[model samples]
Target: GIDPFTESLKEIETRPGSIVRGVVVAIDKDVVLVDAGLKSESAIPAEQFKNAQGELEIQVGDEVDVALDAVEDGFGETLLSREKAKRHEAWITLEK
Candidate 1:
């Protein structure tokens, strides 16, 4: 017997270099906290969410694509990067 709902609730395999979809949980001066189904929320630099016009591009509850650079750092927090995610996707697009 298996419970699909509970299984889906489990933390996903977030191997480094993999792209993950995260929801913006909070915004701060230096970081945008995101929940990507990991053990803890990941903090992405706030600047990455800005445009050339200086407007903050994302808001709370927004879904952002980010790359999991490392499973954990010295602080045991997951490292994320929006730039890398976009770059990886761009490379794939070009290859195909």
Candidate 2:
């Protein structure tokens, strides 16, 4: 049987545009916890939600789409960002 972690890694690797949608679970001064289904949740930083007012635009219970950042952490959870993801994806596509 394949380990779930390894399988997840494979899935992430194969899908360059892989993104997960989840609801905000908690919010702190610096980060927010997102309840991504499965055993893992996402940690998105406040800077990721900054707006023109220099305030965070996201609030608790907001649904968000997060790009997979890294899967090497011990928790196997993904780091997420709305702005950075869009920027990075655009850059990659442009390069291709």
Candidate 3:
């Protein structure tokens, strides 16, 4: 069946627990705004992309794959985490 969400956002699945590719667009303090291939934008912690000096290394237009935790929650926006995603991937890789 054709997913209704895909009909609108071909790159984003409206359901949570799914992964999507997002492009970094803005960096504000400890937060980074991303174009989550959805309605508008999403955010990720700046600490995820650290340089050798421990400063955020991500820049606008850099594409990152993120696992969607929620489309909207207490933060009123899609919440995703690179920490969890990388950890889960590591565990999977470690698994048989």
Candidate 4:
């Protein structure tokens, strides 16, 4: 039997370890919130968006690549990573 809820989650085009384009929703002092077309926004460490000189180059409404670590893990938290997504793209280009 197919569960509609589970199928719906898949239909959203999210999967673990894959890269997704997310929009910047908010930027706080400690975290950057991104909307990856998921049920809820995911917060990534603000430091990830900082350059070597320690400046944040991102702004609200900007689109960024994110690595989906989990659709929804325990506690129903969606995990995302900007750093992993960059590395994932690097590996993809190398493989090509």
Whole-model lDDT, model 1: 0.75
**Best candidate according to TM-score:** 4
Sort order, lDDT high to low: 1, 4, 2, 3
Q: How close is candidate 4 to the true structure, as a TM-score?
A: 0.53
Q: Model 4, which residues run further than 4 Å from truth?
A: 1-17, 71-96
C-alpha RMSD by candidate, in order: 17.8, 18.9, 18.0, 19.0
Clash pairs for candidate 4: none
Q: Identify the superior model by TM-score, candidate 3 or candidate 4.
A: 4
Query: How many clashes in each structure?
Result: 0, 0, 0, 0
- TM-score, per-candidate, Cα-based: 0.52, 0.50, 0.46, 0.53
The runs of at least 3 residues in candidate 2 whose Cα sits more than 4 Å from the true structure, single-residue gaps closed, are 1-16, 73-96
lDDT of each: 0.75, 0.70, 0.69, 0.74
lDDT of 4: 0.74
**Candidate 2 positional error at 55, Å:** 1.1
